[PDB]
Structures are given as structure tokens and as C-alpha cells.
């Protein structure tokens, strides 16, 4: 469908993943209107992250924020691949960070990243599969969304993003109905305790799982987790999504798992990534008390 | 007016800011009587900060302490620019620290400074505006006063201190009456939570704001804070105050905001500053219990 | 006796210490079936420690896990010396870690080791007695088992493992019946407080003692502990057990103490050790509440 | 008077300070009987500190421990200068540490020293007065005794130990009767709060004061503390005690203050000191509950 300032079309891999592309005029107007705040200003004054968010939504006639929220909160969808025409070179890295910052802070706020000391983190890669998982399993607070942007890609074969929607996972019911699905388990980076499965407000399964940080306490927990891991990694429902330079995935971390495919080692290989993670925060008509 | 040991006259920028100058005999007597305690002694034994305070007040016939307190606690004023005749060269830095220490510890106590590990901190600058703000917004305890002294100034164009009294701010009522003025917000350097506005004992607005450390939790808080920031930075009520070498501002941090103007970059530029921050502490006739 | 996949025979030093040796086919099948997970995978994903445990037990027709548990929990025994035919060279260090990991995680889970940052630790030695003690005396949680493997041994004379079963200690009753046996004492690596003696579920003495970390608070506690130390170190019941390359002791840390004999200094000496420590965790028919 | 294994005589400076000297046979027997434990063994196994204490007391026919306790707990005395004939050279430093350790752990236990990471600390000096004070004012637990030993002394003029017994302080009543004597004040190295004065079990004044770590909160506390400091430092009751190599003071830290006199700077100057601090711990006939 055609919106004001951007277009929206389903991905080739799945109708659950929608591709959102900002038009060229929108992209140029946005970058002009945020030129006076470099990324270092966004790092130092967090309210500027919401200022650039409002500027982008205003340029889309205030159609962007409700669309982002409706897509990410919809159980049938919950995932976007987002880009802006004209921003597609490593040479535009700062502008990429601004764009992703503006989109993310229309639907919530990105959390402190311990690897960078900032609200976002950039990594340079210079080859085995990274297993499907959820982010933020080792703290008490829930991470609602994961944002992963491709900043550079050079002599790279493979390395697609892997995604798994729980309602595409053919083994969901077998593991969700197991008593250990509800057993609170230790997660360690202070340790936290929570089950591997939970439910959304409608009672549908959600997941908070990663094989590296879950700490089975005994032979019962450990064997079940090793079978769970195999059942996830071999699922027929996994998507393999290329993320070209300038595009970023933005997914609901509660019923999407994500990972990374193998890639070929190459002497002239360079991949650069940017990530942000946060919680949803939005207005809705709902009950309160007092005045 | 003419006091014992010093003179007092309103500043050129505002009747709220009073200039206090210690006479030459007072300055020389004070420095003689505190010569046996170097600044390093003041750093190691905090009671010596109150000893030098008493010596200065005694030399002013005990007229200094009540005058400082009356000025700083008066809502109509609350700010002083202070100097002593004959102390005006970088070469006298230690004597400047002694003088500011004595004045500050007549009205309270200066807190530990994490940048220096001492009760005061000195910084050397070797050019964009520093936005108006209050100090101490990221801890639970209230910072009542801010002290900023000019220790050296060399090939410096611009860089005046900026000040804003809340009762000179033409947008005060518009933002103080907004519901978000009372919303406790996160501040981070353990995080603390407090609103951007509060009230003094008479119900008049006070502020605890800085754009770098406030952490809006969502799009509502963030957009409002970005508008608040603009309304402060563009206020017609801002003062631009030069602070020559040997002078220091001492302001009530609850209804004065402070910042720093732009200055010209220059290869031979050198500016040195000293700061202290603390809480008020003073005698008054008021109620207590027991015996 | 002859089991499926391994043999079991009493040690030459004591009927309480049983020697368990995995046959050559079992050893080769196990190493083949765990080849796809290097030790670094076991370090990163703790459930793989239980996966390799199940593979080893399955190869022993599920006779290994009940035998290990019965031996370690039996007050009359409680100690094993374990090896696998064909694994006996420093050159096979990784395979040794896999084997010990699989055995340990059939009976419990190995705890984080602060010296290595992993669930196991390897040390290289390149000569006085190490006194008998229990592990884990300076934390609140109980360490149920100690695992010590010989990874390398080169020009080494002496250095046998020393072991003492409390029911072989001729002075047990004299010290267990002393009032200070029940006095909670300070242990320091946050400090913890617990007595030097306790009881098992049947009221038989157990010990949580080490001379380096216990901190007697006064002359009464200190003199008694110095006599206790002498009564332990001179006991006639101490075993001197050689541990050849590829063998590991696995002992119940509650009623076995362990140490190390003196060895000869030698310029070409090299000894490498691996340790793990953990708690028991196993299924049994016992009571619970609710559903 | 003549005891078994040592002699006791009042000092030249004060009848409150008793000089205790171990005879030559006692010193030689003690060092022989503790030869198998080097100081590093005392550092690692704290019960050995009580073992060497018992050996020394046994060599004195068990007359040492009751004498030490009676002297240190007696309000009229409370201070000892202790040495052993034949130990008086830097070359005997280890033996000095053993001797002081044995004496201290007959009357209590020495606490962890943050400057050395051990139960004792050695310092090398290579010249202004160190003001009179009590140790341990910045933690909650009470330090009952201070031990300071002279390990080396080379080209040293001055630098006597200074001591002040509260009942020799001519200004005690003037300050003890001031309301601020009972005001809990902040002490900082987590901060602790306690008054500068307290009382012993008989209601007689004791002190917990040091000028460097007390943190007066305002002009009232600070001026009083500066006058208190002057009243202490100028007291006629201060003792000036030389401490030759091999001697150590052992004083009751509750009603003795201690410091150090000025000394002459000299290019070939070397002074080495050892300190321990701890709490009293001893048997007495007193009430308890239960069985
Ligand atoms: Fe991730
Ligand atoms: Fe400031
Ligand atoms: Fe051990
Ligand atoms: Fe001291």
C-alpha cells in the first residue's frame, strides 16, 4: 500500500515480515532537518532521540508512528525490514544511525548498550551459524524489540539474518506443553530467574531463550534444553533474510527469535553492524486511577 | 552600601546579582592569618575549611556571614559575584581557593567532587554554548549552591557565564503548569527519580534540570523536554556575565540556572576554572523537640 | 564387578575408594559421538555439559549414572578414581576435560571457577605438603563433590593425592564432641559463618574445614583450631593415592578431606591439573506438595 | 617487679606506661619454638598467630597473658612498651613480627590492614608532627588496641611517639561537657556516624577522634572541631616516647591518643615501622544465658 512518505510491501520470505522504504524526498527532508544534531549529540542528550523521531513522523504526515506500532504489536506480523532510498553506503553511517534512532524512538526507547557505553553499538566483522535466540534474557526487564542494521558489507557470501516466528515453529506445542516450559531457570551474563516460555496477554506462547546464558541446574533441565535447542535450530519455519547495506530489521523480541547464517571466510571481508534494543512505549486508551 | 571589610553593589547585568568586593586591607589580613594552612591542609582536614571561614568573617566584624546568607536565600536575589582586591593573577591560584573556601563554608559545606577527588576541582580549557542547567540532578541530595571561579584567562574572546533566574524566564508558567512538570523522571550520571520542577517553601517554582542527564522514558517525555530545552535556551531573561580572573559566582542552584557562552578558538588560548558545589547550613530561630 | 561399558574394582589403598575404568570401545564411541562439540562449546553453552553426560551414560546402557550416585552418596565409600583406556597423554587434554565433564554432570553440576572464569580450571605446576581440607568453605552454598584430574606428569617424584575419610580418622570423636565443633566461625576468601563440623541426615559428622580460610576470633578458637589441624595432619587414616595421567578423583566433599603430598623439586618438572567443584543433583522418590 | 620470663618497670615519661622486657633465655626459647612457622605462614593461617601466642605465654609460666590484660584494661595505665633482649636489628625483622604477633594475640586479634593486605603492615620512611588521634574511627567496629613497632632507625633525629592519656588532658572536662561532644558526626575513609566522645562502662570519657577523617557538616561542628584540635595538640599532658629498634608500643586506643613528633630531614635517613590494630578478646567470669 501507498502511505505518506513511505511505501510498505510484504517480504519475499514471509508475509509476516513487511518491508518499509522511505521515499527519496522524505529521506532528504529528514536528513536536512536533523543536520544540526550530530550522532554525538544524540548520544549525550537522550531527548534528541525523540526529537528526531517526531521530525521523521511529521514528514510522514503522522502516519509512520501508528503504522510501526500496529505492525510490531500484531501477533501475525511483528517484524519490519526498513530502509530509506539514497542511504546505502558505509560513507553514510551517521545518517543510518539517525534514521534507525528516529524509527525506534517512535515506538519506545533504546536501552544502554554495555559493549559501547551508548544507546547503540556498532561492530566490525573481519563464520558458523549464530543460533536463534531472544535478546535481554539475563536481566529482569523485558526487551520488547531488537534492531539490527547493516552498515557495511564487503566481499560477504552468506551471513543472512535468520528469523523464527513462534507460530511458524512446528515444534512449539510439544515444548510449550512440557512442564519444564514453566520452570524458572537461572540466566547469567546478578543472575535472574525466569522460565524459557511465557504467555502474552491472550495466553499465546512467547519465549525468552538463549543457549549461551541459560544455566540448567541439573541433568533434567540440561537434557531438555539440549533437545529444545535442536528442535529450534532444525525448524522448517526459519527465514533466511538478506539485509543489504542501509537496511535494518526491527522485530518483536517476544515471539520472534533471530540469529545469523554461516558465511564464507575471505581475506578482504568486512561487515559492519549496528544494534539497538529497547522496550515499547506508546499511548493507548486504557484505564487508570485517581486524577 | 558600605560594610565592614567589603563593599556591595548591584551588577550591570541585573539587580538580582550583587557584586561583593573585599577591600585591600581585609584581603591582606585574611591571607596573612591563613598562611600556615596550605590548600593541601584544607583538602586533608575539612574542619580547616570552617576555620578559614571564621577568620574571614571575623575580619569583616561578623557582617559577612549574615549578608551572604540573606542574599543567597532571598528569592529576589540569590546570586553573588565575589572578588578581593589584589588577587587577580593565575600566580595567586592557591589564595583564590582559600578565599572561595572561606566564603562557601560560612553558608554551608562543599561536597566531594568526583572529577578531582577533593572538595573542589580545577579545570584547564585549551567553544559552543554550554546549555543552562542546575547542578546535582543525578543524586538524591539537593545541591543548594554552585561556585565557579575564574583562575586564569588568556587570549579568551567570549565565554561569559550565562545565568537565568526562573522569575526572569518568560515561559516559566507555561511549562510549570504542564502535567509533566510534576512527573518524576529518571536522571542518570545509581539512577535517581525526581521531577524537573518542584516548589520552594512558599510554593514558587524551582528547577532540577539538565539536558545531558535527564532520561525521558518515552515519546511523550522526550518531545516535551526538547521543547522545554528550546524555551530555556532562547529566553530573553538570560544574563551574560563576564567573570574576570579572581572573581567567582556563587548562586542559589534552586532558582538560578547557569551555563557558558560560546568563545573563539585560538592557538594561545588558556582558561582555568575552579568549582565547588554544596548544601546550605546555617542557624535560625526555628522549632525543635525534646531537650 | 563387570558392568556395561566399564569395570569397577577397589583401590589398593582403601576399600572406600573404587577405581572405575571405561573400556576401550566405550571410550572411543564416546569421543566420536562428542567430537562436534569442542571444549570451548562446553564452556559457552552449559547444557552441552549435560548432553555429553547423557551420551556417556547411554553408551554404558544407563548403568553409569546410578552407579556413580550410589557410590558417592554411600557413607562407607564416597570416592572414585576414574579413567578411560586410551586417554593417558597431555596431548589428549581436551578429551580428558570432556570425559570428566560428562561424568560430573551425571551426578550434579560444576560451579563457576574464579581462577579460570569457566566451569573448570587447569593449572600448571613447575613442594611441601598441602594440608587436608574441604573445598568451598568460604561461601554459603555447600560444595558436594571435588574433581581433580591429572593432565600431565613429567619428572615428578611424590605429589600423591592425600585423602582422609572422617570414619578413618582416629581423633574424630574427641574433636566432634568438643563444644567448639558446633561454634559458628568466620570464613574469609563477603565472609560467611558456619561451624567446622556438622552432621549428615543420619547425624554422623561431616566437616567444612580449611586452615587458610578459617578465621578464629580469639585465643580460645585459635588454639583449638591449631590442635585440630595437628590431629588431622598426623592421622593414621590418611591415604596416599597416585593419580596417573588421565585419571581423576571424584570424592564426596562432606566426609572426605583431601590434600597433596610433598614432591621433589626438579628443573625439568611439569605437572598439570584440572579441577571442578559442584553440588549433587539427582532424581529420587521423595515427597513434594501441590501439583 | 620480677615475673617469670620477663621484667616490668615504669617508663621515664609516665607511670601509666609500663616497659615490659623479655629476658634473653625467654627470647631465645620462643624464637626456637616458632622457627618452623615463617611469617608467611602466620599470614596465611591465622590460627598460627594464636599458636605462637600460646608458646610465648607458656614460656612465661602463663603469667604474661593475665598481666597484659590487666595492664591494658586498667584505666590508670593502658599502655606498654615491649621488647625482647637480643632482638634489636633490622636484620631481625621477621622475628620482631613474630614477637609482636604473639603478644597481640594473647589479648585479642589483629584486623586486616588495607595498606598491606595482611594482618600487619610494614612501612619505610625516607617530618612535621603527626597529630594525636585514635585509630579505626571510620568503621563501625571498635578498635581496642594499637601496636606500633620500630623495625629500623637510621640517621633519625626526633620522631618520638607522642601519647596522650585522656586523664592527663587538662581540657578534657571543657570539651566532654560540650553538647557537641555527644553529637554523632560523619567519618569518612561507606561513611559511619558516631560522636567524638563516648563513655566507658563506668561513665568515664573515651574518644574516637582524628582530624583527617571527621567531616563536620557545618560551621558549628567545624569551628568546635578546630578548637578541639588545638586544645589536644597544645596539651601539657602529651608524652614524648622514644621507640628504639625492636621495641613496640601497645596501647588502649579508647583512652590513649597517639601521634608522632617532627624529625629532621636527612639524605641518609631510614625509618621502618610495623603496625597492627585489633579488638580485645579474653575470658572473664560473667553472665550468659541458656546452656
Ligand atoms: Fe541477538
Ligand atoms: Fe554546572
Ligand atoms: Fe582443594
Ligand atoms: Fe594511628
Please, which residues have CB within 8 angstroms of residue D267's CB and are 6 or more apart in sequence? none
Q: Is C134 helix (H, G, I), strand (E, B) or coil?
A: coil
Residue found under cell 580469639:
C218
Nearest residue of B to residue D187, measured between CA atoms: B46
Q: How far is the CA of A98 from the centre of ligand 1 (A)?
A: 21
Closest CA to D166 of D212, D140, D200: D200
- Give the angle subtended at the CA of A13 by the CAs of A12 and A17, to the nearest 5°: 90
Tell me how far apart the alpha carbons of residues A263 and A240 are, in angstroms, rounded to a whole number: 13
Chain-chain contact of B212 with A282 (C-beta, under 8 angstroms) = no
Alpha helices (runs of H) in chain B, residue ranges in sequence order: 24-33, 39-44, 47-59, 64-73, 93-104, 172-176, 219-233
Neighbours of D223 (CB within 10 A): 18
Cα distance between residue B224 and residue B177, in whole Å:
13
Is the Cβ–Cβ distance between C257 and C163 less than 8 Å?
Answer: yes
Contact D222, D211 (CB under 8 A): no
Known binding residues of D for Fe cation are: 133, 135, 258
CA distance linking residue B100 with residue B276, whole number of Å: 9
Cross-strand bridge partners of residue C239 = C163
- Cβ neighbours of C216 in D, within 8 Å: 46-47, 50, 109
Mode of pairing for the β-strands spanning A17-22 and A79-84: parallel
Q: Which of B42, B283, B277, B49 is nearest to B141 (CA)?
A: B277
B127 belongs to an annotated ligand binding site: no
C159 within 8 A of C242, measured Cβ to Cβ: no
**DSSP string of D34-96, one letter each residue:** TTTS-HHHHHH-THHHHHHHHHHHHHTTT-HHHHHHHHHH-TT--EEEEEETT--SGGGHHHH
What are the φ/ψ torsions at residue D229 (nearest 5 degrees)? -60, -45
- Strand B145-154 vs strand B130-133: parallel, antiparallel, or unpaired? unpaired
Q: Which of A212, A220, A223 sits opposite C45 (nearest CB)?
A: A212
CB A277 within 8 A of CB A145: yes
Buried b (16+ CB within 10 A) or exposed e, D202-217: eeebbbbbbbbbbbbb
Residue holding cell 512527573?
B183
Asked if residues C154 and C271 have their Cβ atoms less than 8 Å apart, the reply is: yes
Neighbours of D73 (CB within 10 A): 16
Tell me whether chains C and B touch (3+ CB pairs under 8 A): no
Q: Cα C45–C39–C24 angle (5° rounding)?
A: 125
- Alpha carbon distance D133, B231 (integer Å): 55
C-alpha angle C153/C156/C162, rounded to 5°? 90
Question: Domains of chain D (ranges plus CATH)?
Answer: 1-291 (3.60.130.10)
Residue B117 DSSP label: T
* Start-to-end CA span in chain B (Å): 41
**Residue B91: all three cell numbers together:** 600566580
Residue B12, CA distances (Å) to A18, B118, B163, D30, D92 in order: 63, 34, 13, 82, 74
CA distance A180 to chain C (A): 14
Closest CA to C275 of C157, C255, C253, C263: C253
Instruction: Let me know how long chain C is.
Output: 291
Q: In angstroms, rounded to a whole number, what is the distance separating the alpha carbons of residues D188 and C232?
A: 44
Cβ within 8 Å, pair D217-B54: no
**Helix A47-59 crosses helix B219-233 at what angle (to 10 degrees)?**
100
Residues 6+ apart with CB under 8 A from C95: C31, C87
**Interatomic CA distance for residues A179 and B236, integer angstroms:** 67
Alpha-carbon distance of B48 to D221, in angstroms, equals 11
- Which chain A residues have a beta carbon less than 8 Å from that of B212? 44-45
Chain A CB contacts of C64 below 8 Å:
none
Chain A residues touching residue C55 (CB < 8 angstroms):
none
CA distance A105 to chain C (A): 33
Three cell numbers written together for A113: 548498550
User: Please, how many CA atoms are within 13 Å of residue C19, restricted to the half-sphere of its CB?
Assistant: 17
What is the spatial distance between Cα C208 and Cα A260, in angstroms, rounded to a whole number?
48
Q: Enumerate neighbours of A (3 or more CB pairs within 8 A).
A: B, C
Distance, CA of C106 to CA of C120 (rounded, Å): 16
Residue D45: which of A244, C182, C156, C228 has the closest Cα? Answer: C228
Experimental approach was: X-ray
Helix (H, G, I), strand (E, B) or coil at D158: strand
Which residues touch D70 (CB under 8 Å, ≥6 apart)?
A: none
Count other C-beta atoms under 10 Å from residue C45's C-beta.
22
Rounded to the nearest angstrom, the distance between the alpha carbon of B122 and the centre of ligand 2 is: 13
Whole-angstrom distance between the N-terminal and C-terminal Cα of chain D?
41
| DSSP state letter for D214 | E
Q: What does B245-279 look like in DSSP terms, one character per residue?
A: TT-EEEEETTTEEEEE--B---TT-EEEEEEEEEE
C-alpha to C-alpha distance for B252 and B164, rounded to whole angstroms: 11
Q: Which residues have a Cβ under 8 Å from the Cβ of D286 and sit 6 or more positions away?
A: none
Q: Are D9 and D71 in contact (CB under 8 A)?
A: no
Q: Rounded to whole angstroms, how far apart are CA atoms B145 and B136? A: 10
What whole-number distance in Å separates Cα of residue A81 and Cα of residue A18? 6
> Which of C214, C217, C229 is opposite residue D109, by nearest beta carbon?
C217
User: Which positions ≥6 away from A51 have C-beta within 8 Å?
Assistant: A37, B222, B223, B226
Give me the count of residues in chain B: 291
Task: Give which of B197, B204, B200 is closest to B176, Cα–Cα.
Answer: B197
Ligand 3 mean position, distance from CA C166 (Å) = 16
Q: Closest Cα partner for B15 from B163, B142, B132, B179?
A: B163
Strands (E), chain A: 6-10, 17-22, 79-84, 108-110, 121-125, 130-133, 145-154, 161-165, 185-187, 192-194, 197-199, 205-207, 214-215, 239-241, 248-252, 256-260, 270-280
Apex D102 CA angle, D99 and D105, nearest 5: 145
Q: Residue A176, SS3?
A: helix
Contact C53 A222 (CB under 8 A): yes
How far does Cα A153 stand from its chain's mean position? 19
Q: Is B173 annotated as a binding residue?
A: no
d(CA D245, CA D151): 5
Query: What is the rounded CA–CA span in Å between residue C11 and residue C81?
Result: 8
Q: Is the dihedral of CA A224, A226, A231, A235 positive or negative?
A: positive
Contact C258, C132 (CB under 8 A): yes
Å from CA of C157 to ligand 4 middle: 50
In the reported structure, the alpha carbon of residue D147 is separated from the centroid of ligand 4 by a whole-number distance in angstroms of 9
Q: What is the resolution of this structure in A?
A: 2.2
Distance from CA of B224 to the nearest CA of A (A): 9
On the CB side of C135, CA atoms within 13 Å amount to 21
Q: How far apart are CA B213 and CA A53, in angstroms?
A: 19
Element (H, E) at C158: none
How far, in whole angstroms, is CA C90 from its chain's centroid? 21
Euclidean distance between the first and the last CA atom of chain C, given in angstroms as a whole number: 41
Chain D contact probe: residue of C212, C218, C225 with most D CBs at under 10 A = C218
Nearest C-alpha neighbor of C137 from the set C178, C181, C197, C74: C197
Per DSSP bridges, beta strands D161-165 and D256-260 are: antiparallel
Residue A129 DSSP label: P
Give the separation between CA B95 and CA B117, rounded to whole angstroms: 20
d(CA B286, CA B267): 56
**Selected residue of D49, D50, D56, D69 to mutate for chain C interface (largest C Cβ count, 10 A):** D50
Q: Tell me which of B209, B218, B224, B229 to substitute to probe the interface with A (most A C-beta atoms closer than 10 Å).
A: B218
Amino acid at each position: 500500500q501507498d502511505y505518506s512518505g513511505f511505501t510498505l510491501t510484504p517480504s519475499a520470505q514471509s508475509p509476516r515480515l513487511l518491508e518499509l522504504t522511505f521515499t527519496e524526498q522524505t529521506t532528504k527532508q529528514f536528513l536536512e532537518q536533523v543536520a544540526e544534531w550530530p550522532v554525538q549529540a544524540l548520544e549525550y542528550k537522550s531527548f534528541l532521540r525523540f526529537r528526531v523521531a517526531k521530525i521523521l513522523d511529521d514528514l510522514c504526515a503522522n502516519q509512520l508512528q501508528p503504522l510501526l506500532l500496529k505492525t510490531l504489536l500484531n501477533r501475525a506480523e511483528g517484524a519490519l525490514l526498513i530502509n530509506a532510498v539514497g542511504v546505502d553506503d558505509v560513507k553514510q553511517a551517521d545518517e543510518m544511525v539517525k534514521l534507525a534512532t528516529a524509527v525506534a524512538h517512535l515506538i519506545g526507547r533504546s536501552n544502554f548498550d554495555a559493549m559501547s557505553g551508548q544507546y547503540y553499538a556498532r561492530f566490525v566483522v573481519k563464520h558458523r551459524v549464530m543460533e536463534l535466540h531472544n535478546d535481554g534474557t539475563y536481566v529482569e526487564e523485558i526487551t520488547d524489540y531488537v534492531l539490527m542494521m547493516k552498515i557495511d558489507e564487503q566481499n560477504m557470501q552468506g551471513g543472512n539474518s535468520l528469523l523464527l516466528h513462534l507460530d511458524d515453529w512446528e515444534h512449539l506445542d510439544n515444548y510449550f506443553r512440557h512442564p519444564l516450559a514453566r520452570r524458572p531457570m537461572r540466566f547469567a551474563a546478578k543472575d535472574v530467574f525466569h522460565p524459557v516460555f511465557d504467555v502474552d496477554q491472550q495466553g499465546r506462547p512467547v519465549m525468552r531463550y538463549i543457549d549461551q546464558f541459560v544455566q540448567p541446574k541439573d541433568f533434567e533441565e540440561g537434557v531438555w534444553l539440549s533437545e529444545l535447542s535442536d528442535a529450534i535450530e532444525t525448524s522448517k519455519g526459519i527465514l533466511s533474510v538478506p539485509v543489504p547495506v542501509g537496511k535494518f530489521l526491527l522485530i518483536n523480541n517476544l515471539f520472534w527469535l533471530h540469529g545469523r547464517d554461516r558465511f564464507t571466510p575471505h581475506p578482504d571481508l568486512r561487515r559492519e553492524l549496528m544494534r539497538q534494543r529497547g522496550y515499547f512505549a506508546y499511548a493507548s486508551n486504557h484505564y487508570q486511577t485517581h486524577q
